[PDB]
């Protein structure tokens, strides 16, 4: 059957093939067979966040703003710098109730700074009583208040107007956190500020703020019907912070150093483990060798771009033509 | 007319044939015959069919967007909305331009290359029984009746049976 | 399921060729010639990793971004932030599909063209000492042992010293 002379040769040249080829799409067809195809998306996650390149700060039922204001159970986050703050869904406030205008603005800017380094300052408080306390904010089984704030009360049933000021001379910016306490009735305003009305006015060399207290009733949270509205001010180097008020003032103890860097915040419930990876995702950590991923749109660090496709096969060989009846 | 099987794959094409995309035209003692090949035109059509189904009917569902036109005037917020809308139109317009200009190049390259194999396939089946010249035709020996056209169309053409008869023409 | 000098690129894909990618297989007086070949496997490889390294490891830096999901319904700001990421995901997803589809076509086209260059390189190597029956296989006359066949792969194969035997198993 193999008819062949001792001079006639063949020199048949060909390529390789595999019995099992990979299914992968092209621009003309969609079901062409190539030898091996490599995945181009990262559809799997480890399930934990590892703080190998970055310094990860855990939540532990403490949101970022609550640690900023100085809650009693959040007192473990004093002057602790971080590279990426992780917020847990189990977070809940356990102190005096409060709200802030532009909640996302204050949360984003202090997360970008990534530094809660706070320095106490000696404000010249004359004609007030400091260290005000409340029964809904307990520390060490005793009544307390926000750790970084200072409630003010009359001394001999008198509240003289406060004309305190202090300048800024350091080369960096200064961030001040101050608030206004809203009473629940006209009796409380007289009994806690010795004045029927009230006004708060802070000002810098480039901007000013003015808040009028809003008296009235509010729903009870933690056996307290009052509210505190907290505002933030940015003090440039060489600027002067002048505060004039006649009541309903929550005094700040000092200033918070801010900067510009790579720190941010992210809400996730993933635990903390030990690995060596850069990508941070609410589902956990993912490898970054793939050029694309479809785990979650929220990410941090050196991460692949997010796509909505589940799988993207990329050919790494040549077309497969196997079998031929044997 | 002049006849001669003038062109094909060089100079001009054919307009009379409608039944397919690529065909054959032979001249011999029996006259002139024309018939199309259904194998080569299938690949060109399927590649073209692969273009249409990948774009026609493929649309994503968008339900709620921002306002795109405003009868009033505002500051940063309105200006930002006009800016984010303008840069999306520019990117999509450029993506459309790069898409159609690349599909056409592949379509023209593939169609020329796909039926290039059709001309190359016949030459490899006429390794010694035919010659080639510059208008895409052949010089097929031996005497090529209706059977040889069908045999080379259906691929069952044997070069060895008419091998020695082909060489006298090559001899002179 | 038998050794009968099976065809090459246009018909089949071999399974015993694992060390190389584009190898030869000769059937001479000895009988077997399945072996690997160089400078053609690596050339096909070269464009493959070049696509890979540019695609694997090329990662950009993004640290602080806007919130992507919200728990409270807001006005135009939340609507704008939701859209400004919907258009970003949609444009990146189309860019990924267009990239991998275009990257795929050039992979198959280059590999098919790379072997076609190899096949014609041997075809121009032997000027008139061999022809092809039309299946990527040659028909080499004259006394060709494994040393004669191996000399074809490595470059030196003189046509004129083998001219006398070539023309006797040919046209004459």
């Amino acid at each position: 059957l193999p008819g062949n002379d001792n001079s006639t040769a063949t020199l048949c040249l060909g390529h390789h093939a595999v019995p099992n080829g990979t299914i992968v799409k092209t621009i003309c067809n969609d079901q062409i067979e190539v030898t091996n195809a490599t995945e181009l998306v990262q559809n799997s996650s480890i399930g934990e966040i590892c703080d190998s390149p970055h310094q990860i700060l855990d939540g532990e039922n403490c949101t970022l703003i609550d640690a900023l204001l100085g809650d009693p159970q959040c007192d473990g986050f004093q002057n602790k710098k971080w590279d990426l703050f992780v917020e847990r869904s189990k977070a809940y406030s356990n102190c005096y109730p409060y709200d802030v205008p532009d909640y996302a603005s204050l949360r984003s800017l202090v997360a970008s700074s990534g530094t809660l380094e706070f320095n106490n300052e000696s404000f010249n408080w004359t004609g007030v009583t400091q260290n005000g306390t409340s029964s809904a904010c307990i520390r060490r089984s005793n009544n307390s208040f926000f750790s970084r704030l200072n409630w003010l009360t009359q001394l001999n049933f008198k509240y003289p107007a406060l004309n305190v000021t202090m300048p800024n001379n350091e080369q960096f910016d200064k961030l001040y956190i101050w608030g206004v306490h809203h009473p629940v009735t006209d009796k409380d305003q007289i009994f806690l500020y010795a004045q029927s009305s009230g006004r708060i006015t802070v000002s810098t060399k480039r901007s000013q703020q003015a808040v009028i207290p809003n008296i009235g009733y509010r729903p009870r949270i933690r056996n307290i019907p009052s509210r505190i509205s907290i505002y933030w001010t940015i003090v440039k180097p060489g600027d002067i912070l002048l505060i004039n008020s006649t009541g309903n003032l929550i005094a700040p103890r000092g200033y918070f150093k801010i900067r510009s860097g790579k720190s941010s915040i992210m809400r996730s419930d993933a635990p903390i483990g030990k690995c060596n990876s850069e990508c941070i995702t609410p589902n956990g950590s993912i490898p970054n060798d793939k050029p694309f991923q479809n785990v979650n749109r929220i990410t941090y660090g050196a991460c692949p771009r997010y796509v909505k496709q589940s799988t993207l096969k990329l050919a790494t060989g040549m077309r497969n033509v196997p079998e031929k009846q044997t | 007319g002049i006849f001669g099987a003038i062109a094909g794959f060089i100079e001009n094409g054919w307009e009379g044939m409608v039944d397919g995309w690529y065909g054959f035209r032979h001249q011999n003692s029996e006259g002139r015959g024309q018939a199309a090949d259904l194998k080569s035109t299938q690949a060109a059509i399927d590649c073209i069919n692969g273009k249409l189904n990948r774009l026609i009917g493929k649309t994503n569902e968008k339900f709620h967007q921002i306002e795109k036109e405003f009868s009033e005037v505002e500051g940063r917020i309105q200006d930002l909305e006009k800016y984010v809308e303008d840069t999306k139109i520019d990117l999509w317009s450029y993506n459309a331009e790069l898409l159609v200009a690349l599909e056409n190049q592949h379509t023209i390259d593939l169609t020329d290359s796909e039926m290039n194999k059709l001309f190359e396939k016949t030459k490899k089946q006429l390794r010694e029984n035919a010659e080639d010249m510059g208008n895409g035709c052949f010089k097929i020996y031996h005497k090529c009746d209706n059977a040889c056209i069908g045999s080379i169309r259906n691929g069952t053409y044997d070069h060895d049976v008419y091998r020695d008869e082909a060489l006298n023409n090559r001899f002179q | 399921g038998i050794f009968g000098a099976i065809a090459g690129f246009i018909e089949n894909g071999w399974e015993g060729m694992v060390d190389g990618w584009y190898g030869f297989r000769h059937q001479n007086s000895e009988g077997r010639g399945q072996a690997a070949d160089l400078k053609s496997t690596q050339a096909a490889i070269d464009c493959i990793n070049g696509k890979l390294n540019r695609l694997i490891g090329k990662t950009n830096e993004k640290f602080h971004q806007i919130e992507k999901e919200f728990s409270e319904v807001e006005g135009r700001i939340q609507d704008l932030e939701k859209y400004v990421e919907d258009t970003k995901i949609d444009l990146w997803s189309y860019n990924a599909e267009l990239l991998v589809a275009l990257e795929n076509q050039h992979t198959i086209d280059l590999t098919d063209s790379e072997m076609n260059k190899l096949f014609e390189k041997t075809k121009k190597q032997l000027r008139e000492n061999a022809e092809d029956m039309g299946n990527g296989c040659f028909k080499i006359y004259h006394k060709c042992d494994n040393a004669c066949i191996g000399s074809i792969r490595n470059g030196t194969y003189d046509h004129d010293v083998y001219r006398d035997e070539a023309l006797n198993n040919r046209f004459q």
Partner: antibody
Amino acid sequence: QVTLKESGPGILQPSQTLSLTCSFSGFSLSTFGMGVGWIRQPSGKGLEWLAHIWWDNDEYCNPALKSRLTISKDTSKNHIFLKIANVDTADTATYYCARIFANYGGDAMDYWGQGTSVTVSS
Amino acid sequence: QAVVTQESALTTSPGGTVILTCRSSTGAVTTSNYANWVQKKPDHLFTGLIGGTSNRVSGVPVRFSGSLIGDKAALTITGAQTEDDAMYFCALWFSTHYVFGGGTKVTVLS
């Protein structure tokens, strides 16, 4: 010496299954280029080639009897088995198992068996 | 279906030359058809003569030879003897199966 022997039932009823076993000595199916074929003669008409089995488990048979012919081999005990399904009066024939040599240039029909008469009747 | 047709019968004296043919209705007969010639004596078993249209089975005398005569295969018996009175059959390969011919009865006047 190369010898081939055929064995069969001889008398079969219509629409039964024909089983034939070929016994041979002097060669084995493990050698390259070796095969055994089946050829039947209806005792008066011409010759009819049925099928053969090559040494690499390659099967070739008559297309007119593909659905009814099954043929296998046993290398250990050097036997060739042939099965015919749905026998008829046209299958009444003398069946020969024979050696076919696969060499360069073609196949050689060198050695043949004695044969075994098969009769199909009711 | 590829029927194979040869001569019905032939006659010769002891010593004459007999040329048998094997014709195929599918077309040209080539070396790829692998013509096989087998003879059948009335009392002896089947013995093959020519395989692959040119290769001779060892053991047969020199008077038997096979070749290609034009469009058909052929078997040549130069100087036939009294032992050549036997049936003669031809087989052709059609790339899937072997087809045997009708047979040629070579009769030698003994």
